[PDB]
Amino acid sequence: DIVMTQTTSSLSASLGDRVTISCRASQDISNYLSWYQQKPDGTVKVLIYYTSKLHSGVPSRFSGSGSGTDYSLTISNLEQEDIATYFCQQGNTLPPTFGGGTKLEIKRADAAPTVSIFPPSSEQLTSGGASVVCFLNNFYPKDINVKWKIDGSERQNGVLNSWTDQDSKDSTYSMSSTLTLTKDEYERHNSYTCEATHKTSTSPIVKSFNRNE
Amino acid sequence: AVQLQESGTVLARPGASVKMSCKASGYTFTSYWMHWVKQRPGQGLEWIGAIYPGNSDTSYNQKFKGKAKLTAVTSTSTAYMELSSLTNEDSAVYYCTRERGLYYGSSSFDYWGQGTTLTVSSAETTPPSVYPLAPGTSSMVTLGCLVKGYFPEPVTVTWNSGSLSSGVHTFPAVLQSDLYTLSSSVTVPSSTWPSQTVTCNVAHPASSTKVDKKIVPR
Ligand SMILES: C=C[C@H]1CN2CC[C@H]1C[C@H]2[C@H](O)c1ccnc2ccc(OC)cc12
């Protein structure tokens, strides 16, 4: 069908920083384009139809521009409420197709995470389970690589990672990794480490612990 | 003015069929093209079909032909969607949205619903097993509470009746062998605790499971 394509997937901008999204159609669409906004809280509304026609009841900071294939949408002045995933769509032929989406984010200074490792509590350790947790709170570029080197040995089978969206308070990310084992395996290795390789400083922040201690 | 009210979160087993719902209000329901959409996380939006309530004539998509089925009742001012022969690929969140242009239509949509989430798996309502997280003391310290082995979502997490609300990070739930699992963090200075009470309050209305938990080191 008609393949829409946005130039990116995630962006970076601060308050007032005039910025733009650029959609691209597989072919001509005769200026039958529309822009949409989807808050991470599920809701979704429209901004523009027909490349640059404002819907009844939207601010003049938004606008539009379009021709043939290369289309775009700009906000000459940003506000906190304008952070969301932004979609586009062609109204030329069937089936109606959308862009892959473009999420927004505030760009701020790099920051190392506040790591905190946690051995498996006793309440768990008697239930046969053996879960080792590692929190990584308040950090920037989401692009983190985490690894667990038990007795100094790379391992993946057992880990389950979780990521939070951009914090509405100070715009910083957090990660919650958690390695799961059975008691028998836990009771055969000693040194457990939660290594958090990050961009900020070459030094991998390590939070280790020995079960003999 | 105008509003679309999609049904709440719903789930069912694979192979079976589900009936969604999208109620309308504030405009002439009969004379407007109502559309549906499918949003999966990794990808964008996938057009699934549309309908004109007056005659209830349909326009599906080649990919979803025979898969979904659209209906529409006039008196209830409600739009419907029914999926069948389900698989994990259908596990997603669906939307309902109005096409502007009164009788003839147009090139755009104007108003949307809050979206209906759909999950599928062979599993049963299970309550979690809340476990405590303590280190083993610092200046500034982080604690937390871990849940595990519960179904279905969601699950609420508080800290002493929600008295706390700073430096908190309740992480979204992940999945292992068809069961949910998450965690949560709390932030305080070295003083506050263990010198003072610090408990995490959990709630899983599905299993009707209320649990409080004061955490202690070793
Ligand atoms: C099932 C759809 C019907 C509703 N509108 C009138 C007749 C049918 C077509 C569509 C519109 O003309 C239209 C034509 C071509 N391409 C379109 C692409 C998107 C779109 O927005 C719903 C409407 C389009």
* A86/A103 Cα distance (integer angstroms): 6
| B113 close to B170: Cβ distance less than 8 angstroms | no
Burial class (CB in 10 A: 0-12, 13-18, 19+), B106: middle
Q: Quick one: which of A178, A156, A102, A125 has its CA closest to B171?
A: A178
CA-CA distance, B93 to B126, in Å (whole number)?
Answer: 23
Residues in B closer than 8 angstroms to A127, CB to CB, are 129
B2 near B27, Cβ under 8 Å? yes
Q: Which of residues 116-135 of A touch B (CB under 8 A)?
A: 116-119, 121-124, 127, 129, 131, 133, 135
A112 plus A197 within the same structural domain = yes
Q: Which residue has the tokens 């046969």?
A: A128
Could you tell me the sign of the dihedral formed by the alpha carbons of A183, A184, A186, A190, in that order? positive
Q: Are A118 and B144 in contact (CB under 8 A)?
A: yes
d(CA A96, CA B107): 9
* Technique used: X-ray
Q: Same domain for A113 and A71?
A: no
| Tokens linked to B135 | 């280190």
For residue B146, what are the β-bridge partners? B131, B183
Report the C-alpha gap between B101 and B104 in whole angstroms. 6
Backbone breaks in chain A (C–N > 2.5 Å) follow which residues?
A: none
Cβ(A57)–Cβ(A47) below 8 Å? no
Could you tell me if A95 and A160 lie in one domain? no
Domain final residue, candidates A87, A107, A127: A107
Give yes or no: residues A97 and A134 share one domain.
Answer: no
Q: Whose CA is nearest to atom 18 of ligand 1?
A: A91
What is the DSSP code (8-state) at residue A81? G
Rounded-to-integer distance, Cα A84 and Cα A106, Å: 11
Angle at B137 between CA B135 and CA B143, to 5 degrees: 40
The answer to whether residues B29 and B5 touch, using CB atoms and an 8 Å cutoff, is no
Q: Report the 3 state secondary structure along chain B.
A: CCEEEECCCEEECCCCCEECCEEEECCCHHHCCEEEEEECCCCCEEEEEEEECCCCEEEECCCCCCCEEEEEECCCCEEEEEECCCCHHHCEEEEEEEECCCCCCCCCEEEECCCEEEEECCCCCECCCCEEECCCCCCEEEEEEECCCEECCCCEEECCCCCCCCCCEECCCEECCCCEECEEEEEEECCHHHHCCCEEEEEECCCCEEEEEECCCC
Q: Where are the beta strands (DSSP E) in chain A?
A: 5-6, 19-24, 33-38, 44-49, 53-54, 70-75, 85-90, 102-103, 114-118, 129-139, 145-149, 154-155, 173-182, 191-197, 205-210
CA B157, CA B171: separation in Å to the nearest integer? 10
Neighboring chain B residues of A99 at a CB cutoff of 8 Å = 44
Count, residues in chain A: 213
A5 touches chain B (CB under 8 A): no
Angle at B158 between CA B153 and CA B159, to 5 degrees: 150
Are A30 and A100 in a shared domain? Answer: yes
Query: B77: phi > 0 → left, psi -120 to 50 → alpha, else beta; which?
Result: left
Residues A101 and A1 grouped into a single domain: yes
Q: What is the CATH number of the domain that holds A70?
A: 2.60.40.10
Domains of chain A: total: 2
CB neighbours of A45 closer than 8 A, spacing ≥ 6? Answer: A36, A37, B111, B112
Decide: A93 in ligand 1 pocket, CB within 6 A: yes
List, in order of start, the domains of chain B with CATH numbers: 1-122 (2.60.40.10), 123-218 (2.60.40.10)
**What single DSSP character describes residue A121?**
P
CA distance B115 to B36: 10
- The side-by-side arrangement of strands in the sheet containing B140-146 is B131-133, B140-146, B183-189, B169-170
Resolution of this structure in Å: 2.9
User: Are A166 and A67 contained in the same domain?
Assistant: no
Same domain for A39 and A82, yes or no, is: yes
Q: Which domain holds residue A189?
A: 108-211
CB of A32 shorter than 6 A to ligand 1:
no
- A116 and A177 in a single domain? The answer is yes
Question: Which domain-ending residue is among A82, A107, A132?
Answer: A107
Domain termination residue (choose one: A73, A107, A141):
A107
Phi, psi of B31 (to 5 degrees): -105, 45
- Cα–Cα distance between A144 and A104 in angstroms, integer? 19
CA–CA gap between residue B14 and residue A28 (Å, rounded) = 40
Nearest CA in chain B to A116: B142
